C-alpha cells in the first residue's frame, strides 16, 4: 500500500505506540516460551492502544520477527546490563549515550529495531532487579512528612527512635 506522507513529529508520536506494542508482544511471547524462566514485569502486560492499528501491528511484527533471534542474545545482555548497573536515576543518561553510539556511523532499519530491543531490555532489567527506585521515594516521603508535620519533634521529645526499643518488651 501507499507509504505515509509524514512529518518528523508525527513519526516521533507514532513511535510511542510502536514501542509500547512491541514491548507488550515481545514480553508475551517470552512468557509463553519460557514459562517461569521469563522475568515477571507487570508494567508490560497492558496494551494501551488499539492492537489492529497500523502502529500496533508494526510493533507486533517487529516482536514476531525477533522472537527466536532475540533469545540467543539474552546471556550476553544479562551480563552487559549487570555490568552497566542501570537505575531509574541514571537510565536516561545511559540510554542516550548508548543510542548515540549505536547511530554514530549511520541509520538503517536494523539499528532502529535494535534500539527498540534495547529499550525493552532496559525497561525489563530495571524493573526485574528492583532498580526502579520507588521504595527509595517512599522513604523520602516518610522522612519529609515526619520532619514537617511534627512527628519527628514528637519522637524527639520522647527520647528519639531508641525509645521504640521498649516496644515488644513487656
Amino acid at each position: 500500500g501507499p507509504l505515509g506522507s509524514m512529518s518528523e513529529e508525527q513519526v516521533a508520536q507514532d513511535t510511542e505506540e510502536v514501542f509500547r506494542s512491541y514491548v507488550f508482544y515481545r514480553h508475551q511471547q517470552e512468557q509463553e516460551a519460557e514459562g517461569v524462566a521469563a522475568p515477571a514485569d507487570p508494567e508490560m502486560v497492558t496494551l494501551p492502544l488499539q492492537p489492529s492499528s497500523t502502529m500496533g501491528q508494526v510493533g507486533r511484527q517487529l516482536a514476531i520477527i525477533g522472537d527466536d533471534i532475540n533469545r540467543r542474545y539474552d546471556s550476553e545482555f544479562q551480563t552487559m546490563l549487570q555490568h552497566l548497573q542501570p537505575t531509574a536515576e541514571n537510565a536516561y543518561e545511559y540510554f542516550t549515550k548508548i543510542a548515540t553510539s549505536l547511530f554514530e556511523s549511520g541509520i538503517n532499519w536494523g539499528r532502529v529495531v535494535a534500539l527498540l530491543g534495547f529499550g525493552y531490555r532496559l525497561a525489563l532489567h530495571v524493573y526485574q532487579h528492583g532498580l526502579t527506585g520507588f521504595l527509595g521515594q517512599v522513604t523520602r516521603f516518610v522522612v519529609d512528612f515526619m520532619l514537617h508535620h511534627s512527628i519527628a519533634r514528637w519522637i524527639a521529645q520522647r527520647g528519639g527512635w531508641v525509645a521504640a526499643l521498649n516496644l515488644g518488651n513487656g
Binding site: I65, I69, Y73, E76, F77, M80, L81, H83, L84, Q85, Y94, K97, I98, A99, T100, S101, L102, S105, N108, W109, G110, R111, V112, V113, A114, L115, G117, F118
Partner: peptide
Amino acid sequence: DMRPEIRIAQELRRIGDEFNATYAR
C-alpha cells in the same frame, strides 16, 4: 574501551546490521 555502555552499543550495532542484512534486503 570496556565501558559497558560502549560494549552494549557495539553489540546493538552488530545485531542491527545483521537484522538489516536479513530483512531490509
